[PDB]
Structures are given as C-alpha cells and as structure tokens.
C-alpha cells in the first residue's frame, strides 16, 4: 500500500499549477510569446523536480 | 566571351569511416572528454567520389558541404553558392589563386559550366550590378589530402580546413585529424545549390577527382589529452554500444 | 553564547587580499564612426536594410545621445550604462524607417509582416535598438512615395536575411507570365506618409546596434587606460573585460594560434592571453585555508 | 458594450483602423491573437483623461 | 569510489545556468545593471544550495 499511495500521489502532482498560468505545457505556448513562456515553464520545471 | 560546355563528370561511392573533426570553439582543453552538439559528418556512411573530365555540377548544399581533394596539380580552385544561380538572386563567388582569394556576393549570371580562361572569370558570369559586400584576403589552398567543411548559420558563412600528408592509398586513410576554423563572415542569403570552379589552360584535356559529403546534426564525445589535440571521438548514435559509451561518459 | 565549553571548533576561513589592481588593453586608437551612421539624411527601405561593420576602434557611446533626439535605449544582452568597459570582437549597425505602430516588431521572437518578411531578429539577440520619429524629414503635404515594405513571401524569413528579388507573386494555379492580372500581384507596396496623420501612423527611423561576444581577439571597446603588469602576486586583474584576482605565472601550455583562454573542469577561466604581448599567463587563487580554536571551559 | 460571437476574427487590420501605438494585453500576447479560438467577444469603449 | 564521485558530481554542478544568462558571478556583474544583476545572483544560489 505504501508503494502504490507513493506512485499515486507522484502522478496526481502532474495537475499543479505552481504559480503559473496553466498546468499545460501546450497551452502556455501557444498562448504566450516565446521569449515569455520560460517564466511560466520554469516554474513547472521546479516543482516536478 | 560567352558560355560553352565541355565538362563530363562520372560518380562513384565510397566510404567515410571516421573523418570531418573539427574543434568547436576556441577555447583550450586538456586532459579532459568533452561533449558537444553540432553539425558534423556520421561515421560510416556514403561520401561521393566526383571525376570530372573533359554536368550539371549544382550540387545541393543541404545543412553543410565536406569537400576532401587529393590531387597536387592545383587545378582546383574556388566555389559557388547560391539558390538559383541566376542574376534575380544574389550568390557567392569564392575565387581562390597563388597570391589571393576575393570573396564577392553580388548577382551575377551565371553559365552552365564556369571555368576560367587562364587569368579571366567571363566564363563564369555575365556581369554583376548590383552588390555590397566584398573581401580580400590572402589564399585558403596552400601525397597530401585537404579536407574543408562549409556550413551557415543565422547569416553566418563558417568554412574550416585542415592539410594532411597521406601516403600511397586508394582510399580514405584510417585515424583522426581535427580540423580548424579560418574564415567566419556575415553572408546573410539564402543557400540552396552550390558549384565548383576548374581553370583550363589553352584548349587543353583536363583530369580531376574529389570527395563530397554532407554533414547532419549530431552529438560527439571528443577526447582532449594533455597536450591541446582532439585524439579520439565518439558518435554517440552509431550503434548501441556508443551510445552506452556516451552514457557512461 | 557568552560561554564556551571545552572542545575544538571550526570558526573561519583566512585568505589573502589583493596589493593593487592590473589592466590591460590592446592597442586602439582610432575613433569609431558612429557619427556616419547617424546624419546620414538618407534612410534605406526596410526591405532593402544597409548594414554597416564597425571594427578597430575606439566606442564612446555616451556621444551617440548628441546626434539623434531619441529617448531611451532598448538593450536585451547588456545594459546602456555598462558599454563603455565592455570589449566585443565586432559591431554590427543596421539602419531602416519604418512605421509607428511597428516598432514593437523589432524584437526577439516576435511575429508580423515586417518581423517574418522584411526584418528578422534572432531568438538569442544581444544588441540595442534606437528608434526615433522623424515626420518633420520623412513626410512631404503631397504624400510621400520613397519608402516601400513586403506583403507577401512563399515562406518566412530567417534571422539577419535580406530579400531583395522583385518578381510578380502568384496566387493561383495560372502562370503570371510577368503581368499583373488577376491572382498576380506586386510584392511591393508604399508607406504613404503626410503631416496630418496620428503618432501610429508617422515614419520613424530605427537603428540595431549588435555586438559579438569574446571568442576572437578583441577590437572594439571604450577609452580605458592600461597599466603594467605584474606577476607572482595576489593582485586584481582585468583582461578584455574578463575581471578577477589571484596570482599570475608564466604558462608552459602550448596554446594554438587561434586560441585565446583556457578553461577548466569547474568552467573557470585558469589560462589567459595578453592582448598585448602575445604571451600565456596562468591564474591561480589566492592562499587560504581554515582556522580552529582549541580552549577549555571559560570557568 | 459589443458582443461579438459567430464570426472570423482578423486582428492584424486592427491596426489600420486607429493611429494607436501599442497593444496592452495581460492573459494572452497580441501576435498569437490569430491561433486561438474563443467563445464570445466583448467590446467596450469611452473617452477619458490622459 | 561512492565518496570520489559524489565530490567529483559536487564540482561539475558548478557549471549549470539555473536559467541564468551566465554561469560566472564576475560576467553577470560586469554586463548588467546592479538592481538587475541580482535576480541572475538569485538563481545561481537557489541551485547550488
Ligand atoms: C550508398 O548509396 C548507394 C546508392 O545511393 C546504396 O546502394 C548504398 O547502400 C549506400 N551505402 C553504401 C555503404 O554504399
Ligand atoms: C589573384 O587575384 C587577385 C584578385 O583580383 C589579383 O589582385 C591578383 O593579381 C591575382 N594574382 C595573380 C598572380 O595574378
Ligand atoms: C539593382 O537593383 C535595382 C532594383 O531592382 C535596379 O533598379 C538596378 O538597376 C540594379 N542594378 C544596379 C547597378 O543598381
Ligand atoms: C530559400 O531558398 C529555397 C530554394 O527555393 C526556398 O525553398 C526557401 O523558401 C528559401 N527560404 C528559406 C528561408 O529557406
Ligand atoms: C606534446 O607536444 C609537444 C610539443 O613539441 C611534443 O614535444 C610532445 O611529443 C607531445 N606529446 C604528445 C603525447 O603528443
Ligand atoms: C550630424 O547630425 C547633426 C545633428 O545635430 C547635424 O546637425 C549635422 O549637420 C550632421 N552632420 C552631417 C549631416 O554631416
Ligand atoms: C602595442 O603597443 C606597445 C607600445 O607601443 C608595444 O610595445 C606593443 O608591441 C604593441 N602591441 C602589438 C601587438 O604590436
């Protein structure tokens, strides 16, 4: 049980925001500018590391 | 004068094994593996073996050209670059003799099969109007192989060469041999199709054979050893085993 | 705590602090001919850009405020106020009108007809970009008719290409045969500017200034003055505008000719070259190490 | 206020309509307006001090 | 050799951006401005920490 309430909780933290606009990669580009949307990916990054 | 067309030109295949090494900056090293992501020549694979005697030499150029010559009777000299080789595009006109090279981007009309008198480039184009940019510097070509790699990037015209003594052989030799940068400009065109340059004397029956080959983008694993020279490289999407070598670094 | 038990512990680090300070320049000393490129009461069109090399010369930017009546800087590598220590390999100007509300497209991942047809910046752009009006010089009561843009391109453009070809552009499957008839349309079209028109719709002059970084020996940089140089000592150096501190020796390393630093595992730079005497120094930091303190009870 | 809603939305000849200098968008940016696809559109206007 | 490489790992850490425009302290202080250098200066000490 401990194992399988890890891997489920790993997967249910996909759906975080972590301060950024979406939680979806392909909605933050394309619908931001490119040279913008690292802010918002950086965010992302950190937190799922 | 005018344009005549008296060139033939037969190919053949032939392999690469493990040439087209250049260092990718210019910064020293030692003692050290260094992984690097560029546009290089794979391992093993097809290079063409031109002879041309005496066409339709507008070969593509792709992402970048590596040119290997062995001859020694100098009969080799200059390059074009261009996308339609006509005077409604700007092109490249690399023209190399014993004292200097001019590099002149400008749109000329070219013929079907430029050459030169031997000393005058009315064979090659028409006349050229219209142009900025020119340069003069002193002459790239100086039992000997001459390697050259010609590439571009964000209106850049990057070209690295290197020269090696080779002994009695049929084929391309066995080993490494880095090459080294001589010439970055700011070309800022479009590059399609590219030609070579040959100078016939009179006229008079002429000989010659080279080696093309076309980079791709690719991840290496180059090897410094103590001293400043790259002695060893790996590609690192050849085969399973390289790529666990490029893993484990 | 005002009290200390018996024991050993580690309370800080020594080093040594540098004597003085070391620069040295190449030599430089011509003017560089940011003036020209200013002034030039002449403007190319945007689709048709000129493009100027500016090497081998001494930049003094604070100057360049005195020939345009612009207002402020736009720089993305690097700051205005830091381009006088800065030293760059070449520079590069570029000089167009265009108008008012496209202004904004000259920029780093942008998109728009003069961003993908006329004029491209790359992705990684290090540079500055001046742009100021101009109605009183560029518009005439008549209209004025000299400066033309692109429309249509088969594809778009990449970063720092010119196009220059002027053909009939196709839209249907019918050849154009050199005629503008139906589906066969020019690819140039005209600026019309007037006096009486909004602050969106006036022409404006713009100037990209970019600049190469560090990998080749360099040419262009500000008036700063250099000094002697001295070895086997904690001293403060300052090569190209490669600033630090540490102890200068001669170099056995065989560096090759084209070659101008040194680096290392950590990607520092351990190895450098004078740019005046071509000769290779080798860095090392400064002494220093850790310190203890052994004592008893304070009782 | 306009509502607009069941129709192509071509942004690019805004800029040919008012002599403005820039847009001033917040959730989305202005050159990447021709790619997304919305519901409903609202548009309000007025005259204000500078 | 578990100790040899967790150093080894420790020193090549040193060479990530974190997202910065430069890995070298003295680059960033020398290209930009000092109330701006400092979000730069951030990174770097959130990924070495
Ligand atoms: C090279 O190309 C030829 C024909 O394009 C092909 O038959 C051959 O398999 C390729 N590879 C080698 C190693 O010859
Ligand atoms: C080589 O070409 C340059 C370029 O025009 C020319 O100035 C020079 O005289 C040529 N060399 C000889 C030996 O004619
Ligand atoms: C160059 O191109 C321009 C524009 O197409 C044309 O007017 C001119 O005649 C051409 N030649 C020269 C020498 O300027
Ligand atoms: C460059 O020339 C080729 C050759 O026709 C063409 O297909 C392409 O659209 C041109 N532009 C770019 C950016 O490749
Ligand atoms: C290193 O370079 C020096 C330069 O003369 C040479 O003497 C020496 O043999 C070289 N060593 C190796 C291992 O290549
Ligand atoms: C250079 O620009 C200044 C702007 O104040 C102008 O007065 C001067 O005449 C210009 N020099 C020329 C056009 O040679
Ligand atoms: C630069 O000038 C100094 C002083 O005149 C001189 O000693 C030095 O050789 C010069 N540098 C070069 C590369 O000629």
């Known amino acids: 049980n401990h194992n399988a309430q890890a891997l489920n909780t790993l997967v249910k933290q996909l759906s975080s925001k972590f301060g950024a606009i979406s939680s979806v990669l392909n909605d933050i580009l394309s619908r931001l500018d490119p040279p913008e949307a690292e802010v918002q990916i950086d965010r992302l990054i950190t937190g799922r590391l | 004068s005018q344009c005549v067309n008296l060139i033939t030109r037969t190919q053949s295949y032939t392999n690469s094994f493990t040439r087209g090494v250049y260092y990718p900056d210019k910064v020293f090293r030692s003692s050290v593996l260094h992984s690097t992501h560029d546009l290089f020549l794979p391992f093993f694979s097809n290079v063409t073996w031109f002879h041309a005697i005496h066409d339709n030499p507008a070969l593509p150029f792709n992402d970048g050209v590596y040119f290997a010559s062995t001859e020694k009777s100098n009969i080799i000299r200059g390059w074009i670059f261009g996308t339609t080789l006509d005077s409604k595009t700007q092109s490249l006109l690399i023209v190399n003799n014993a004292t200097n090279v001019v590099i002149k981007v400008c749109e000329f009309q070219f013929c079907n099969d430029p050459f030169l008198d031997v000393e005058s480039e009315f064979r090659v184009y028409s006349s050229a109007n219209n142009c900025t940019f020119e340069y003069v510097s002193q002459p790239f070509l100086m039992k000997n192989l001459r390697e050259f790699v010609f590439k571009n990037i964000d209106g850049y015209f990057k070209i690295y060469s290197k020269h090696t003594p080779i002994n009695l052989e049929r084929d391309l030799p066995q080993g490494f041999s880095a090459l080294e940068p001589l010439v970055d400009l700011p070309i800022g065109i479009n590059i399609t199709r590219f030609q070579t340059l040959l100078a016939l004397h009179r006229w008079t029956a002429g000989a010659a054979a080279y080696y093309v080959g076309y980079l791709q983008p690719r991840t290496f694993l180059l090897k410094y050893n103590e001293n400043g020279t790259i002695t060893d490289a790996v590609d690192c999407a050849l085969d399973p085993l390289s790529e666990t070598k490029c893993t484990l670094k | ?299």
């Open chain 3, 1 to 299: 705590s005002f009290t200390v038990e018996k024991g050993i512990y580690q309370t800080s680090n020594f080093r040594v602090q540098p004597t003085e300070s070391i620069v040295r320049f190449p030599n430089i000393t011509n003017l560089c001919p940011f003036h020209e490129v200013f002034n030039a009461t002449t403007f190319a069109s945007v689709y048709a850009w000129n493009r100027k090399r500016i090497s081998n010369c001494v930049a003094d930017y604070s100057v360049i405020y005195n020939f345009a009546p612009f207002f402020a800087f736009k720089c993305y590598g690097v700051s205005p106020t830091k381009l006088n220590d800065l030293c760059f390999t070449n520079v590069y100007a570029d000089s167009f009108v265009i108008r008012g509300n496209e202004v904004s497209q000259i920029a780093p991942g942008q998109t728009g007809n003069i961003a993908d047809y006329n004029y491209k910046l790359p992705d990684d752009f290090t540079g500055c970009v001046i742009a100021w009006n101009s109605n009183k010089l560029d518009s005439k009561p008549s209209g004025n008719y000299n400066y033309l843009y692109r429309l249509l391109r088969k594809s778009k453009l990449k970063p720092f290409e010119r196009d220059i070809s002027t053909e009939i552009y196709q839209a249907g499957n019918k050849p154009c045969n050199g005629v503008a008839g139906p589906n066969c349309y020019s690819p140039l079209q005209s600026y019309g500017f007037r006096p009486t028109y909004g602050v969106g719709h006036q022409p404006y002059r713009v100037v990209v200034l970019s600049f190469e970084l560090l990998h080749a020996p360099a040419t262009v940089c500000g008036p700063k003055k250099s000094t002697n140089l001295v070895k086997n000592k904690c001293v403060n150096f300052n090569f190209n505008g490669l600033t630090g501190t540490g102890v200068l020796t001669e170099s056995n390393k065989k560096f090759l000719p084209f070659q101008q630093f040194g680096r290392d595992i950590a990607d520092t730079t351990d190895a450098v070259r004078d740019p005046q005497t071509l000769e290779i120094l080798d860095i090392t930091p400064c002494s220093f190490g850790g310190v203890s303190v052994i004592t008893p009870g304070t009782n």
